[PDB]
C-alpha cells in the first residue's frame, strides 16, 4: 500500500479529528512524485494537509518563520523526512505568466519584502563566488560536449566576472536565490536561500523569463533568449520593487529616482551574468552527481551561450 | 567570532581578534560583547528556538547554525530556590507556564519523550519504571507544550517581573509533568559551595495551599474561566492528582546519566497511596 507511513504522521502531529481517526478512513492523494521531494494531499472527509517528504537548517527555520508572519503556509508538524504543511488551493505559475503586469509587480514587491528581512543566518557574502569557485574546480558525446563548454575558457571568464561584479556595488541582503516560476505559488522553497548580493536575486529572476522546465521529454527544458525582460519591462519591475524596499524612496526627486534606477539597471543586468555562470557551472556538476532527471549539459550549454550573448549586449 | 562577527549586524562585521572578549559561564555557554550576546556551543531544535523567538516569548535570536546559537543577552540575575515559594513569583510562573502550554507547536503530539528518555549502584531498576509507567498510564493529563525544566536557575528575574529561558528540553508532554516538575524544584538548591554542590528538603515542597494558589493562577491564564466555583474546585482537585502523581515522573527521570532523587520518588510513593 502506497500510504505506507503517511497515516502515522497525520494522526500524530495534527490535533482534533486526526487525533483518534482510524486507518480505514485515511485519504491521501499524490500531487508531485519526486526523488527528493514527494508531495501528498492527505485529508479527512485543519481538514487537508500537504505532506512533503525527502548542513541545512536554513530552509526549515525559514519556512517556520514565514508561517509565523503569514507570508507562507502554516507549519503543521516537522520531522526528519519532511513536514506536514498547510494545504492552500494553489499552483506553480508557469513561465509565461511572469511578464504579466499583475504578477510581475507583486513578485517585485514580494522580493523587496524578502530582501528587507533580517535573519539569524551567516552574513558573510560568501555564497556566490564561493560556490562558483568550488564548482569550477570540481568541473576540472558528453566527453565531447564538456570540451565545447570548456573551450570557452571558464577559469578565466570567472575572474573576468569577479572583476566586473566587484566593480558593481550591490547591497547585501537575504536573497531567495532561486526565484523562478516554479517557486512562486506566495513565494516558496528556500533550498538555496542565503545572504547574497541583491543584484543576483533580481537578475536571476530576469534570466528566468527565458527558461521553462515544465517538461517530460528530454532535454526537459526550453530556452527562449528573445524572452528576457525588455528595458521598459525591467524598469517596471524595479519601480514596483524600490518603493516596497525603501520607505524613503517615494519622496525622492526625479533626478535621485532616475539616477537610482539607471544604476540599478546596470546592477541587476551585470548580475544576470552571474546567474548564467553559477547555474551553468551547477548544471555540469549535476550531469555527473544526479539521481534526479534533466538535460544537464544541454542546460549548461544554454546557460553559457546566454552568458556570452549577455556580455556582448552589455559591451563590457 | 568568527561565529559572532559572522552572524551579527553593525560593528560586529568590523570587529577583530584580539579586540573581542568572551567570558565563560557554563557543551558550553559564553558571553560575548563589543569592545552583548550569549554564545551557546539540530534542525528540529532550531525550528523550535526560532518559532518561540518569533512569538516574542524568548530571548531574541541572532544566529543559528549546526553546532550552536547566538542569543539576546538579557540583563538579570537568575532566581534561587528559596524565592520560588514567594506567593508573587510562584503566581507569575503559573501564568507564564500556562501560555507556554497553550501554544501550538509543530511536534509529535503522542507523549513518547517521557518514557523514551528514561529508556535511553545496587538500585536494580527497569521493573520500577514498569509500575511507574502503568500508574501514570492511568492518570489522564491533557497534553500541552511543556518546558520540561522549570527550575529556579532557568527563570530570570530581569531588571511580570520574569520570563523563562533555556528550552533545550521543550518537548510535547503530559501537563502533569511540567507543573509537577516545577514543584519538585522547590526542594532542590543548586547553590552550596561544598560537595555534593546541592542541598535538599522534602519540607520545602509546596503545601496543599501553596500549590493551589499556583494552580488557580495557571487555569485563568489557560482554560472562559467564569465556570461555577464548584466546577473550578473539581478542576483543581482533578489536577492535584495529576500534578502530584506526575511528580514521580520528575524525580525518576532526573536520574540524569549521587543524586538520590529516588529516595523522594519512593517517598511520594508511600505518601500517595500507590
Ligand atoms: N502548501 C501547499 N498547498 C497546496 N499545494 C501545494 C502547496 N505547496 C506546493 N503545492 C503544490 O505543488 C506544486 C509545487 O511544488 P514544489 O514544492 O515547487 O515542487 P518540489 O516538491 O519538487 O520542490 C504546485 O503546483 C502546488 O499546487
Swiss-Prot record, chain A:
Homodimer. Heterodimer with CHKB. GO terms for molecular function: ATP binding; choline kinase activity; cholinesterase activity; ethanolamine kinase activity; protein homodimerization activity; protein tyrosine kinase activity. It is an enzyme of class 2 (transferase). The modification N6-acetyllysine is found at residue 126. It is found in: Cytoplasm, Cytosol. Its EC number is 2.7.1.32, 2.7.1.82. Pathway: Phospholipid metabolism; phosphatidylcholine biosynthesis; phosphocholine from choline: step 1/1; Phospholipid metabolism; phosphatidylethanolamine biosynthesis; phosphatidylethanolamine from ethanolamine: step 1/3. It catalyses: choline + ATP = phosphocholine + ADP + H(+); ethanolamine + ATP = phosphoethanolamine + ADP + H(+). Its main location: cytoplasm. One of its GO terms (cellular component) is lipid droplet. The modification Phosphoserine is found at residue 151. Homodimerization or heterodimerization is required for the choline and ethanolamine kinase activities. Changing residue 151 to A: Abolished phosphorylation by AMPK, preventing localization to lipid droplets and subsequent acetylation by KAT5. Keywords: Acetylation, ATP-binding, Cytoplasm, Disease variant, Epilepsy, Intellectual disability, Kinase, Lipid biosynthesis, Lipid droplet, Lipid metabolism, Nucleotide-binding, Phospholipid biosynthesis, Phospholipid metabolism, Phosphoprotein, Transferase, Tyrosine-protein kinase. This is Choline kinase alpha. Signal peptide: none annotated. It comes from Homo sapiens (Human). Belongs to the choline/ethanolamine kinase family. One of its GO terms (biological process) is cellular response to glucose starvation. The lineage of its organism: Eukaryota, Metazoa, Chordata, Craniata, Vertebrata. The keyword Transferase applies. The chain holds residues 86 to 457 of 457 of the full protein. Changing residue 151 to D: Mimics phosphorylation; promoting localization to lipid droplets.
Swiss-Prot record, chain B:
The keyword Cell cycle does not apply. Disulfide bonds: none annotated. The lineage of its organism: Eukaryota, Metazoa, Chordata, Craniata, Vertebrata. Changing residue 59 to S: In NEDMIMS; a functional model in yeast shows reduced choline kinase activity. ATP binds at residues 40, 72-78, 151, 166. Its EC number is 2.7.1.32, 2.7.1.82. Changing residue 112 to R: Abolished acetylation by KAT5, leading to prevent conversion into a tyrosine-protein kinase. This is Choline kinase alpha. It catalyses: choline + ATP = phosphocholine + ADP + H(+); ethanolamine + ATP = phosphoethanolamine + ADP + H(+). One of its GO terms (molecular function) is ethanolamine kinase activity. Plays a key role in phospholipid biosynthesis by catalyzing the phosphorylation of free choline to phosphocholine, the first step in phosphatidylcholine biosynthesis. Also phosphorylates ethanolamine, thereby contributing to phosphatidylethanolamine biosynthesis. Has higher activity with choline. May contribute to tumor cell growth. Changing residue 122 to A: Abolished phosphorylation by AMPK, preventing localization to lipid droplets and subsequent acetylation by KAT5. It is an enzyme of class 2 (transferase). Homodimer. Heterodimer with CHKB. (Microbial infection) Interacts with PI4KA/PI4KIIIalpha; CHKA bridges PI4KA/PI4KIIIalpha and hepatitis C virus (HCV) non-structural protein 5A (NS5A) and potentiates NS5A-stimulated PI4KA activity, which then facilitates the targeting of the ternary complex to the ER for viral replication. The modification Phosphoserine is found at residue 122. It is found in: Cytoplasm, Cytosol. Its main location: cytoplasm.
Amino acid at each position: 500500500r502506497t500510504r505506507r507511513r503517511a497515516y502515522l504522521w497525520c494522526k500524530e502531529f495534527l490535533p482534533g479529528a486526526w487525533r483518534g481517526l482510524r486507518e480505514d478512513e485515511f485519504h491521501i492523494s499524490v500531487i508531485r512524485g519526486g526523488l527528493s521531494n514527494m508531495l501528498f494531499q492527505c485529508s479527512l472527509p485543519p481538514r487537508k494537509v500537504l505532506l512533503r517528504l525527502y548542513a541545512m537548517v536554513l530552509e526549515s527555520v525559514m519556512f517556520a518563520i514565514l508561517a509565523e508572519r503569514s507570508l507562507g503556509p502554516k507549519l503543521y508538524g516537522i520531522f526528519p523526512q519532511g513536514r506536514l504543511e498547510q494545504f492552500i488551493p494553489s499552483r506553480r505559475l508557469d513561465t509565461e505568466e511572469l511578464s504579466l503586469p499583475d504578477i510581475s509587480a507583486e513578485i517585485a514587491e514580494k522580493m523587496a519584502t524578502f530582501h528587507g528581512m533580517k535573519m539569524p543566518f551567516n552574513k558573510e557574502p560568501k555564497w556566490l563566488f564561493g560556490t562558483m569557485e568550488k564548482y569550477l574546480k570540481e568541473v576540472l558525446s558528453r566527453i565531447k560536449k564538456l570540451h565545447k563548454l570548456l573551450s570557452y575558457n571558464l577559469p578565466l571568464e570567472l575572474e573576468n566576472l569577479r572583476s566586473l561584479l566587484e566593480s558593481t556595488p550591490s547591497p547585501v541582503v537575504f536573497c531567495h536565490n532561486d526565484c523562478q516560476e516554479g517557486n512562486i505559488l506566495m513565494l516558496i522553497d528556500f533550498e538555496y536561500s542565503s545572504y547574497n548580493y541583491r543584484g543576483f536575486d533580481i537578475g536571476n529572476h530576469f534570466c528566468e523569463w527565458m527558461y521553462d522546465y515544465s517538461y517530460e521529454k528530454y532535454p526537459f527544458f526550453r530556452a527562449n533568449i528573445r524572452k528576457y525582460p525588455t528595458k521598459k519591462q525591467q524598469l517596471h519591475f524595479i519601480s514596483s520593487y524600490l518603493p516596497a524596499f525603501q520607505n524613503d524612496f517615494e519622496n525622492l526627486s526625479t533626478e535621485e529616482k532616475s539616477i537610482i534606477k539607471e544604476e540599478m539597471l546596470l546592477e541587476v543586468n551585470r548580475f544576470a551574468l552571474a546567474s548564467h555562470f553559477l547555474w551553468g557551472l551547477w548544471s555540469i556538476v549535476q550531469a555527473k552527481i544526479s539521481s534526479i532527471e534533466f538535460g544537464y549539459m544541454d542546460y549548461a550549454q544554454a546557460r553559457f551561450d546566454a552568458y556570452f550573448h549577455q556580455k556582448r549586449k552589455l559591451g563590457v
